């Protein structure tokens, strides 16, 4: 007769997207700890699909999430349950993913977007990365920041170059964006044109 007890305890994940993960924690106990997994606190229901548990002798207990997606990133709760007592373990599942560029559309291996004097552009470049890259825009040797003649809108998923006033003759050429994180960087080039 004895208290459940986590000969191994669960440990921190670091995945990339849509992969698979197991997170794996060894259970002692008299009798036979029940065993449950939560997520900030809400039980997961294994499903199969999503969620997989699966057992073996001699205590082994995981959690398979699969396809991660960044709401699983999270931390994790489990619970092992008999007469003895009541003891749960935690464990966060983080994403940690090289920053990177998507460009929506590209003209001879470069982004291209076509304008008028009047048009107020926005070159939308969504981008991945976990962190949270720090994003800068340059022209030529021109850093860009939101002071009179742009605005960078940078966001978890997204960043646009935005030309307040109309696009003009001059702001037409070449626009470099940038994406950095812990894991690695990325860069593209879009030209902008005013006909």
């Not at 207990?61 to 007592?85: C, E, K, M, P």
Request: proline content about 5%; overall charge positive.
């Amino acid at each position: 007769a004895m208290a459940p007890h986590f000969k191994e305890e669960l440990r921190n994940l670091n995945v990339r997207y849509q992969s698979n993960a197991t997170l794996v924690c060894k259970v002692t106990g008299h009798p036979k700890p029940i065993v449950k997994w939560y997520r900030q606190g809400k039980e997961i229901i294994a499903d199969g699909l999503k969620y997989r548990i699966q057992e073996f002798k001699g205590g082994y207990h995981q959690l398979i999430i699969a396809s991660v997606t960044d709401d699983d990133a999270t931390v994790y709760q489990v619970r092992a349950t008999n007469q003895g007592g009541s003891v749960s373990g935690t464990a966060s599942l983080e994403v940690e993913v090289p920053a990177k560029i998507h460009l929506p559309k590209t003209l001879e291996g470069m982004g291209a977007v076509h304008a008028l004097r009047g048009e107020v552009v926005s070159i939308k470049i969504p981008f991945s990365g976990k962190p949270d890259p720090v994003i800068t825009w340059q022209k030529g040797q021109d850093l860009i920041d939101n002071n009179g003649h742009y605005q960078v809108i940078v966001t978890r998923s997204f960043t646009s170059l935005v030309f307040p006033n109309g696009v003009e003759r001059k702001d037409a050429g070449f626009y470099v964006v940038c994406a950095k994180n812990r894991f690695g960087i990325d860069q593209k080039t879009v030209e902008l044109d005013v006909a």
